[PDB]
Amino acid sequence: AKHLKFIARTVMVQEGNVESAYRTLNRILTMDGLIEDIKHRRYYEKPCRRRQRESYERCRRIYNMEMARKINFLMRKNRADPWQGC
Amino acid sequence: SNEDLPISMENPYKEPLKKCILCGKHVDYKNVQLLSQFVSPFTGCIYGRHITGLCGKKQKEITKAIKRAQIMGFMPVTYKDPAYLKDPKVCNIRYRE
Amino acid sequence: RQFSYLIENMARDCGEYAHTRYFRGGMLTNARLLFGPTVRLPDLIIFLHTLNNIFEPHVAVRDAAKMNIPTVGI
Amino acid sequence: YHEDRIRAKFYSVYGSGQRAFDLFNPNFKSTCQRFVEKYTELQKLGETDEEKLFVETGKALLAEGVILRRVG
Amino acid sequence: REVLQLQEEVKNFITRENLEARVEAALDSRKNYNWAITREGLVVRPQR
Amino acid sequence: KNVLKIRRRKMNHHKYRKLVKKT
Amino acid sequence: DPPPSTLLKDYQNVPGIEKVDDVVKRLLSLEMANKKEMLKIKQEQFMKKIVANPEDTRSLEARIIALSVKIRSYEEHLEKHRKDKAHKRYLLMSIDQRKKMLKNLRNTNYDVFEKICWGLGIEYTFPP
Amino acid sequence: TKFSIYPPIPGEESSLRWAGKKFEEIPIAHIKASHNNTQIQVVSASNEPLAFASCGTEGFRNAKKGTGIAAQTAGIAAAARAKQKGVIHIRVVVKGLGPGRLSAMHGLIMGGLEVISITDNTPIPHXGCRPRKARKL
Amino acid sequence: ATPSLRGRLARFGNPRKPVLKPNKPLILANRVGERRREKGEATCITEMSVMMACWKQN
Amino acid sequence: PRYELALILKAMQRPETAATLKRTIEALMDRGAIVRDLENLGERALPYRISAHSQQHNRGGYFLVDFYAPTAAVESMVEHLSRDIDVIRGNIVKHPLTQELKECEGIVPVPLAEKLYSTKKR
RNA sequence: AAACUCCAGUUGACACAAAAUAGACUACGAAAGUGGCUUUAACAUAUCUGAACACACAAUAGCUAAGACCCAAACUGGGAUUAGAUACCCCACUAUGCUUAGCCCUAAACCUCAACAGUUAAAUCAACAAAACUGCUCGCCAGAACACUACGAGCCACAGCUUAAAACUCAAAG
């Protein structure tokens, strides 16, 4: 309301490529957390339920980031079996 | 006895501890150019430490300085001041890909 | 499996026996059913590698002790 | 070992030289080990300071023909 | 040492005698608190 | 654990409150 | 209360502070400091008036004086903040802690226990 | 020059022009993408209404308004009325995450308008009014 | 870097209240999840609209 | 103790800006303040539109006043600034240079937490 | 469907309401609790343990009195659904959530894991859960149900809270 307009969340279209511009805008809102925040704000999330979700989302980040670290660590070993026959 | 036995030392090859880009520097709420480097250019959202790369002490200092600068009439809230859009990029985030 | 061929040759050369393959359940504790009632079990078992391919002790280490067979192991 | 302190400083000042370690040869002497050996000899003379003793060691190797390119 | 430093600084403090002169001097001057950091941790002062 | 012990107490309290209101 | 012109406990013994400019003197006085700086002076005055060794801060005497200065600060805080339940708890706990210190001092050194009660105006009361 | 996704600042001097008009003078297409309806109003750079079209004004009723095709039809209708008044280039300002958030934009392009920028203005309270209670479904 | 797990769970040596309340032990399994099928959307809705709009005119 | 007054003044001509700055410094001194320095940060566009005293402001003159005052003076000065119609926004903060930043050795690494679950074979 | 059309969209002015991002941080407080900004005051104890009742606190709901009105919302009304629908779904609106001054003293107030001091060796260890233990102290528990009940007593509580049985019944309950 008080801020200047057409500066925040504004993306310029390149060569009339509106699809790519919209995808860029949607990716900016997703990475900053605005999209997921808007969906959670539609109905009131009670504090205990918010704490239960945040705890869930944090444990998933931990597990997922550790699994991914193990996948990248072991990927080199996907090479062909060097002792074929033993 | 023998002279070739291992002796007790502290790891002489130990590398110095890593320091964040703001280690040892004063974070002032008046310094809006610095503070703008840690907010989203599109939404004004403060970046987390996994993006800024700051230590816990400087992440708190930057956060508290931004919240002070914003309400005291020094910094915008909903976007990054366009004047600071060409400052050195120090945050590990890419929007275009 | 990098040394299965070497170990199997070394055993044949000295007139002994080698087991470098997947160790099937009961080779030692159920031998009389697997091989025959009059089969003679080894008197000594030498482990050149005591770990299986999931970095856990080779099952034969436990089964050798069950059968009271002395074991040498690197 | 005591020489680890010297080895650490040498690698920091000069870094691993282009000469590649040959670990198959049991008597291989790297440029760092040559420095350690010389440094240890100059310590027997009676020098009690690291800075001067360290600098003097580098000069001796340069006279012998060793290439010591500092990181700088 | 702190008392000595303070005794020097108080000589430049604004008083009721020099208030008007110091206000005019402030209106002429500019103080900039802005500086940017780089990925190498170096301060980039503003060029203006 | 199941909530069978809570359920017995839940009905006791509900019925008691309803009784107190009635009388 | 110590006058507002009283110099801070840190600058009271620096040589030549009696000759510095008036502006410097009020910048190093209690007037320009927070409430905690004036409590350090209250503690010092009680220590010099009561304790035999004003520099021993680990004796049961010095600890009763230090706690009594805190108790008074909580009572003054609560005179303005009558619904501050956190500080009301700190006051009541501190009063109980001082009573335990006074019971121990009375049991070990009665002569000094009398000087604590007179200097600080504490009336020892036996528990119910 | 490299393309800048960042919009031109109104105060600064820019070379980017659209039919001889600066970015600050291009008319604005305000899209309200709700969960059940899409409303499109094209206004001039001085806040003069030019065209309005919603899924309701196009004849869709009840749950049929909350569809991409309905929003696309409203976009085409708004573009037609705006193009009669002289609008070619529009700055889109979309509000909400409804089904017709993108479809309304396609309709505006299918209707002959050129979109030069997209701004999202979905209202996000920074702490605000407590929303309605969660639905038990 | 993975978020820290030090002092996050309710344990005998932890004085603070638990930060996390995992419903499953935070231990890596020996499997990953199956590849999720993509939920289908109605295709050819813009072209269908263009043809049906023309039918209405003609 | 030492404070910093961040004063955003209405965009005025030099004679009125000088009177307001004198007015403000005299109010500090009347409440027992020792004013140390006055810094001009320049006139700039405000980060957002600020409505003050029934006026909408888009520009202002930023100024800083470093001073010493008793703790009780802060509340009184805040009240005085509220009634001044030439001040867009005034905030008194504890001077940032009084606080001493502790020396930092650097980032101490924290390893993966261990022994969170018993070593029994589930 | 009802409802609204004194409606909706853009723009401007505009709270005694609530506090995106930071926070992938794990801090503060005795617990309850505490995450917008500023300032003031301010976070007991130089051995430890020590109370259903003493003393001081104690989420939410609730009570008394005076105010505040964005939004939410028990109850209630309307729409829909249904065999019925005193519900789940939609709309409207109140008590209530807020401030001030007094009450009430409850929670799955549970991290169901007491305070302080130590240990990782031995028999590690029923099972599961969050590995097994030592010293010391206070509190508490001795089949299920009756029973967060009856009676007595205390209480600003009066449809309340705290303390808390027995008879009959069963051979299980857990």
Ligand code: FES
């Ligand atoms: S690592 Fe030193 S302050 Fe960040």
Ligand SMILES: [K+]
């Ligand atoms: K906030």
Ligand SMILES: [K+]
């Ligand atoms: K209880």
Ligand SMILES: [K+]
């Ligand atoms: K619990």
Ligand SMILES: [Mg+2]
């Ligand atoms: Mg279950």
Ligand SMILES: [Mg+2]
């Ligand atoms: Mg019953």
Ligand SMILES: [Mg+2]
């Ligand atoms: Mg569970």
Ligand SMILES: [Mg+2]
């Ligand atoms: Mg109708």
Ligand SMILES: [Mg+2]
């Ligand atoms: Mg968050």
Ligand SMILES: [Mg+2]
């Ligand atoms: Mg105790």
Ligand SMILES: [Mg+2]
């Ligand atoms: Mg008792």
Ligand SMILES: [Mg+2]
């Ligand atoms: Mg309560």
Ligand SMILES: [Mg+2]
């Ligand atoms: Mg109430």
Ligand SMILES: [Mg+2]
């Ligand atoms: Mg409402």
Ligand SMILES: [Mg+2]
């Ligand atoms: Mg109401």
Ligand SMILES: [Mg+2]
């Ligand atoms: Mg709780």
